[PDB]
């Protein structure tokens, strides 16, 4: 189904699992074990976005405009 | 065969006081079956093994204020498939009744050794 390994799909899967985890981080704030993971995964997504910005500018800007991902910290 | 579509498998054991008749027993049966089904339970399968002496004595207080000391007991066994969301009120509702002295519920995992 499309490319399940593609940059844009992976970044989507990460963004979605993150917004899913935000709800559990809210209901129980005292779970740090979970948050440590959230930080890891958010780190991966950030990584791929940076890589993707290096490789192709158009696909990148399209993607972070599309999935509502915040603009990058290189500015 | 059992095949849940987006539900979890469950076993529940409940224990009732030995002084009960079969009509009060089937009244509770009916009540909890209806609770399960109202909570989105396909396949409510009920089974019963009654009046076995307990390992140890158990005390239950009633709403009438009675202290009931028991020896025997009535074991009801429930195999049902429910949303993981709705198992929550069931256990409290089981603890609530004066007829259920000891209740417990288990999730069932497939055995592979």
């Amino acid at each position: 189904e499309e490319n399940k390994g593609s940059v844009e799909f992976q970044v989507f899967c990460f963004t979605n699992k993150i917004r899913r985890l935000t709800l559990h981080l809210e209901l129980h704030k005292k779970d740090y074990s979970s948050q440590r993971g959230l930080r890891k995964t958010l780190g991966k997504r950030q990584r791929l976005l940076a890589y993707l910005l290096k490789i192709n500018g158009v696909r990148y800007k399209e993607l972070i405009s599309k999935l509502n991902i915040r603009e990058l910290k290189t500015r | 065969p059992q095949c849940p579509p987006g539900l979890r498998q469950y076993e529940t054991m409940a224990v009732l006081r030995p002084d009960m008749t079969e009509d009060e027993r089937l009244t509770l049966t009916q009540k909890y079956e209806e609770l399960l089904v109202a909570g989105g339970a396909m396949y409510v399968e009920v089974f019963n093994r009654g009046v076995i002496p307990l390992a140890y004595s158990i005390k239950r207080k009633n709403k009438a204020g009675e202290t009931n000391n028991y020896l025997d007991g009535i074991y009801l066994l429930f195999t049902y498939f429910t949303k993981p969301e709705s198992i929550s009120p069931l256990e409290a509702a089981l603890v609530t009744d004066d007829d259920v002295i000891r209740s417990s519920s288990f999730k069932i995992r497939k055995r592979k050794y």
Partner: protein, 60 residues
């Protein structure tokens, strides 16, 4: 030699009471010569049964 071919649960009391001592204590894995996985499941079982008064904590 000895083995479990039937599903172990808290409600097979023959099964569990094989693995319980005289005084109701749970026997160690070294004695019962079971795989680790087995002994764990046994133990959880014995406890759950213990709460349902199928098997006693202490004796009479």
């Amino acid at each position: 030699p000895i083995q479990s071919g039937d599903r172990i649960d808290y409600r097979n009391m023959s099964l569990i009471s094989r693995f319980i001592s005289e005084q109701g204590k749970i026997l160690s894995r070294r004695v019962n010569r079971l795989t680790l996985k087995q002994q764990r499941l046994i133990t959880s079982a014995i406890k759950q049964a213990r709460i349902l008064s199928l098997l006693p904590f202490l004796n009479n």
